[PDB]
């Protein structure tokens, strides 16, 4: 059942999603926006941060409710929703994973009402897919580390107060030879590159990072040394589960001008939901859309109870949902016709925001064989 | 959450048809035997007549219980597990139609362990998915009704001692004119066809019932004239979720042994399981399965609520639970390689199995044909 | 075996859709521009004409030969191949129709280099798969017909120097009522309206037409009152073969994007082409465009060789072509990964691109229908 | 083009096929029978051995014309289009890589209307997909090589005449140390196991054999030691194409009972083919198959060219006709409704039958990798 406090929050964010996000959207997209509006307005609702911890000033309203959160925003503006995802994701190595002191030291700036922004920067051009393959390295240089290399397809990279770089401190030892710190904007070294030019999630920022001869002080390091890659691997698992939630928000935000659609658009003499092939069409994909969105809450619910089945059925939830998403998002460009093809009627953007669900948080060849190991090597 | 109840019926499900019915599943197919041994030993366990209600000496369970119990048997037996759908899909009319004098007179000797058999006799040569074109009359003469027509495809038609028979009593009136009716086994001009050969469920009975001047007591109408059609199609809502319950097991016991024959089969030097393509296809089944499984349990859910939902996500349930057993029997057959073709190895037969989940209790192109019916004009 | 002729024209197509239009086709799409400059080159080559006869000054070289210009065309830019398509079907009413007299008034304009423009003017707002619902309307007064109505999503409508316009003359015969009529550019009362803003082919004009009581000469009219509807389902039948092509093109060229990417991308210290999975997608990629080159190619023929047949195979050749086209793409973008999502390596793009393919020239619900009653109904 | 010799072969197998063979087909599946009526008229008939050369009293009639035959058997009856498969891939390796001494010694009993059958034995318990693992050996000793192993899944190993078998001269050398050997019936040390139970094409023979100090004349060696690996991979890439021809067949004979179902069934007051579903439904499956048969001709043309893109085209052509004939056979069920799951109405023995094409002559995952690969890595 859904606390009292769960279902307001809810409530406030399909009234948000509805009134302030939705009528913003196409814009966003069409000028390739920042969503600041967006970004403000959580941040005084107190929506920007929902996983920060109640000892650091925030809500800690757990990953079934920022799930639910992210549906309802996917709905509208996938963009807006990975806002939120990129958000949680970059302060989950520190609270999972940082000292008492660390935490203390750079989750306070984001109590309350803060507009501060986070990212988590792992991949770099020459480790996607293949993590362990990260050039960036961190080397020990008295009271600090000294960081070298390079990431790629930074989600608010360029824009954010706080970074979490993985970076290898022992090459020779592989997964046991990557640490995570905590990189300040303003640090001497972090360098900027290219927002690159996206198909979809147009209004949001993705960044290239380079760190030149980059000094942090050595008390930034998140943990022991050689444990980042576990932490890597720890915040994987529930953001997995949150792009399943965006990718579902997407497919019912589809699926539901394709319904609208149907009712209203009139040939052969009737509303068009009178022909037998489009009534399969909208059954295939509703059915497609609660299956996923089922797969994710319970995914949802198993990390909030600290469940291991949560990496299984995480994974499954990340690689249905997205499929839904392009499945769906395809089909529902299609129930609309030549309207469908139009940037006006917003289907559109969403078939390209659906296809970036299917590869970020890890592609769904990444995503099946998470799931595939998990099945035949319990 | 699930009852102290439902969980020691649950156990003892799982024990049941792991020790019992699993080894007797490739017999009970080779020689298409009627499970008299699971029958008997259900009836002694409580587990014949799960919605039996409690007026009437049953245990009344609920129909997520049933669900729950439908999966356990269709993971090792599916003809096993439809002995116990058109048990209670037997029964269901007159318990959801029936005065309290019919209810009393024929639901009390179902009660405690008793081994009596129901049907329900609706489908006709002339009409499967067009139960309207049926031709089965119903004419009042006295004390009586004097039935005239045929049935087919009625499980356990020639065993049942109950039987709820569908005919019009009115022509003209279309889904108005259609009564349902209690027909004892041993009524004269009841005739018995033949039992037709199946590509799979072979450990059932599937018959021809035949009525020629058959004369049946005025009181044993259930309900007024002309409210049978709106009798069959309530029983339908709920017979489509215990098809899709057994059609999750199916899916599942496929999948279970896949994941075996992974692990034990080695082909290039390790076992087939440490192969990418197989682990895909296993991270696919699985997925659809668990998706399957989690539409079943919520649309049973809704069922035992009686929510008016029920319609949409059990017609959304039994159309994907029974494409997955299709899809998953299919694959699973393909993982076991020439072994998965033989007979002795069983998912070959639950292939054959899975084939007709996508059929009876309606077909799957009515089944989303009510979904998008339902989605499109709510 | 292709004429000399054909192997000539093929390997000039080739030749210039790598050298002059494959460059080209970022900035078509980025900035939304007319391939003026294709379209300059293509009179100089002879290509922009095709199927116009040799009567009147053209190279007649039949629907195969097209066929395969569209696929080479569509591999580099679908909005290249799109000009070619919208070109040929402007004219084909024309050729196939009209009177000796109408054939050599307007035909002729478009002999050798010529660089005038055609265009097909059928669907209106309350007109696209219904075509027979079509508003528009031709009243015939002295030596004229007074036209009224509107045009919606006509590929090179503003830009066309000749508009065939299909308009009903007596709404009373139905499918027996409508005739097709030759529109000249500066025709008074022929206005234009918005140049509509699209997912994909964006290097295409695609325009509002509004008939504002345009008088066209009595002599414009195509073949005889009430045989437009007839003339207009000929043109569609070959137009589908069309788009079945440059369907195949697109995913060819998406395909060759992603094989490429394969080779040279290293991920987990070899290659990604060493991946099982990756051999998978690409092995199910290349079956599916090869399967759909070859029911392209039949249809070609069959239209070539005037056999009733032709109807049939182009129905399914459009289908999976462009379902091919469209799932192709979706997994060019995937096998890229993060990069497959950047506009700067053109996969993106060619995604966009397939989805018109399975709406334009008919529906992919309409073309299953054709094809299942030609199957049904023979 | 086809030949007249062609021509007249195809009219008779289409006679044979329709008047002889179909008839039969649920009687040969329903009691497990040798197709001996098909074997002894096929001799008659010149259709027993279309491969075996002129120059050893064969038709020598090439790939394509078995592949038009196979696929007119398989549209009637799958079992007996496997005779024709294992009879000419039993023969193949003999044809491909005998010596002339060899060829004639062996080939010259197949003659005219010869009844003698052949047998291919490669496959092992330890030795599916990875041929390479068999264990068998073939050790020499004087005039003798003395043969020791075991084979299974052998078509027609207990009643061939001749049984080309593959073993190793050399386990060290791995895909080098593999030889072809002809092995007569009654010859000591050759033992038959058990004749195997299967889901479908029930009207074979599929072999256990077992080589017990089995000694053979050195003579019956085909080609040099170490070579026998290579012949047995060129047999497979011809015996692909031939899988890829029966699936068509079984596709294509599914859809005609599906297509004469849909005229002849009425539901909702006229015939079922009236319903856009149902039309759809079979327009996808019509698709499939003619693009399966566009594939399989075009590896069968290259084969018969000798061209190295045989191999490629073949690979495609077998993955997609047997996923074709299963979907197909899968909907051909369904379109049949109940009477589909019905033995009597062959739908139900074409989809067992069609699940094998995609296991036998290497699976659908083996296919996809050689396909997969002979496009990464031309
Ligand atoms: C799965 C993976 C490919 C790694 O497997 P390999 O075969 O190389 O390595 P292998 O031999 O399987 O494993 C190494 C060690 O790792 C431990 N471990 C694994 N999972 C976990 C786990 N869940 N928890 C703890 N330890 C784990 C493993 O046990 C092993 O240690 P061991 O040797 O046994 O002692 C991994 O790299 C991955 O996942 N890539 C997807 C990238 C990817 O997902 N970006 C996402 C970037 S962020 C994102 O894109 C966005 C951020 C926010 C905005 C939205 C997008
Ligand atoms: C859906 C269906 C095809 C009927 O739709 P049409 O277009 O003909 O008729 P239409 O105009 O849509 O409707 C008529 C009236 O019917 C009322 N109603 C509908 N659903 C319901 C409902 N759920 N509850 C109450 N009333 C309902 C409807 O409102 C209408 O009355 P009205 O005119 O409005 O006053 C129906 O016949 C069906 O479903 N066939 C599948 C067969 C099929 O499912 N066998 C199963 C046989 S049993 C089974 O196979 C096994 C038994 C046990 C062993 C396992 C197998
Ligand atoms: C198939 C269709 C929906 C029409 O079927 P209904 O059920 O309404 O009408 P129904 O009762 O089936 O039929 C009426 C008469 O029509 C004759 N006929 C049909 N096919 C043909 C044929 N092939 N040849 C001659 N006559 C034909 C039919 O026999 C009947 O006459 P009858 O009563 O028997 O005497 C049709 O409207 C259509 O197809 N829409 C797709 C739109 C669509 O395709 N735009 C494309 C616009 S152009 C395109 O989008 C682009 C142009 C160039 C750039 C690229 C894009
Ligand atoms: C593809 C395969 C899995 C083999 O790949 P691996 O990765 O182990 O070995 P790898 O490293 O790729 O290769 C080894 C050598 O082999 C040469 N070669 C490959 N293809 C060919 C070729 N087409 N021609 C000549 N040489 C070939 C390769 O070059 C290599 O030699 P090299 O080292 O380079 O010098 C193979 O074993 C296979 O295919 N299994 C399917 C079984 C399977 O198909 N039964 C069918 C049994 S019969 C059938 O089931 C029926 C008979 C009649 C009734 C119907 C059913
Ligand atoms: C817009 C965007 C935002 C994202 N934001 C973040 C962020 O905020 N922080 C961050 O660190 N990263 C981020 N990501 C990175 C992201 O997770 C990846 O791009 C993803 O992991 C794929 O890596 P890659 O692009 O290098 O593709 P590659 O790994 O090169 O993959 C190419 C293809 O090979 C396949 N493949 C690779 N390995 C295997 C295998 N072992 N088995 C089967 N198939 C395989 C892949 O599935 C894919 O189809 C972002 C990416 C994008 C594009
Ligand atoms: C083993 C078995 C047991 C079952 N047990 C019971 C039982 O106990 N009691 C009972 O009364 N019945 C029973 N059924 C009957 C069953 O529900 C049906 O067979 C089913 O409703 C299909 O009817 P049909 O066989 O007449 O097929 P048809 O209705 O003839 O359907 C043929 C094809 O047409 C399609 N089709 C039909 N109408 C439409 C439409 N409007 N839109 C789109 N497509 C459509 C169908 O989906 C199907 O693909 C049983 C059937 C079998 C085979
Ligand atoms: C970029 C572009 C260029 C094209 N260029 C040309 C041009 O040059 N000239 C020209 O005249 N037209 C042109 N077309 C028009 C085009 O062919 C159509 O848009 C198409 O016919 C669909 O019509 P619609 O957009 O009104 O969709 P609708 O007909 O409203 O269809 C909406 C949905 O309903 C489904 N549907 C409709 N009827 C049925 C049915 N009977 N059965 C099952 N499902 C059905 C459709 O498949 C679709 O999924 C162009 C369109 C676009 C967008
Ligand atoms: C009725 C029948 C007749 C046939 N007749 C002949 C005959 O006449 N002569 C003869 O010699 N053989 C014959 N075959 C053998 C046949 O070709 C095989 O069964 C087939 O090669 C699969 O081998 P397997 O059964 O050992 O399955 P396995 O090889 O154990 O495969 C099990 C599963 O693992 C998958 N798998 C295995 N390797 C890989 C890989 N590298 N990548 C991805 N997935 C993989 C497979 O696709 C399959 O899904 C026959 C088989 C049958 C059942």
Redesign the interface.
């Known amino acids: 059942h859904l606390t009292e406090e769960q279902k307001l929050t809810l409530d406030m964010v399909r009234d948000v999603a509805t009134r302030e996000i939705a009528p913003r959207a196409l814009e966003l997209d069409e000028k390739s926006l920042f969503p600041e509006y967006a970004r403000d307005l959580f941040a005084k609702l107190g929506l920007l941060n929902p996983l920060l911890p109640a000892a650091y000033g925030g809500t800690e309203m757990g990953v079934l409710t920022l799930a639910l959160i992210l549906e309802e925003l996917g709905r509208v503006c996938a963009s807006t929703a990975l806002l939120l995802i990129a958000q949680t994701d970059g302060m989950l190595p520190i609270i999972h994973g940082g000292s008492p002191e660390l935490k203390e030291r750079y989750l306070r700036r984001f109590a309350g009402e803060s507009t501060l922004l986070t990212a988590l920067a792992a ?1 770099e051009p ?1 480790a ?3 993590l362990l ?1 990260m050039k960036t390295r961190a080397v020990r240089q008295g009271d600090k580390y000294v960081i070298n290399g390079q990431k ?2 930074i989600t608010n990279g360029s824009v954010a107060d706080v970074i979490v770089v993985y970076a290898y401190t022992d090459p020779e030892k592989g997964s046991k030879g990557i640490s995570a710190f905590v990189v300040e904007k303003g640090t001497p070294g972090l360098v900027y590159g290219r927002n ?5 999630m147009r209004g949001s920022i993705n960044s290239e990072l380079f760190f030149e001869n980059m000094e942090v002080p050595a008390e930034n390091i998140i943990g022991a040394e050689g444990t980042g890659f576990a932490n890597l691997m720890q915040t994987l698992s529930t953001n997995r589960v949150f792009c399943a939630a965006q990718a579902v928000g997407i497919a019912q935000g589809a699926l539901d001008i394709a ?1 609208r659609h ?2 209203d658009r ?3 003499g009737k509303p068009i ?1 009178h ?10 994909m ?2 497609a859309v ?3 969105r ?2 994710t809450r ?1 995914a949802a619910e198993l990390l909030d109870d600290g469940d291991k089945k949560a990496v299984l ?1 995480g ?2 939830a990340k ?2 949902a997205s499929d839904t998403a ?1 499945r769906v998002t ?1 089909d529902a ?2 129930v609309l ?2 309207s ?5 009627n917003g289907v ?1 953007r969403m ?2 925001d659906a ?2 669900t ?3 948080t890890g ?3 990444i ?3 998470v ?3 998990a ?3 319990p």
């Open positions: 991949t020459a996607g897919s293949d393959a790629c397809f690159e030019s996206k198909m979809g319904v149907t009712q009139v040939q052969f939901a022909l037998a092939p489009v009534q399969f069409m909208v059954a295939d509703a059915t609660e299956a996923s089922l797969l319970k059925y994974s499954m690689t249905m392009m395809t460009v299609q016709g030549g469908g093809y139009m940037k006006e559109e078939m390209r296809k970036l299917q590869i970020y592609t769904n060849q995503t099946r064989m799931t595939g190991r099945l035949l090597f």
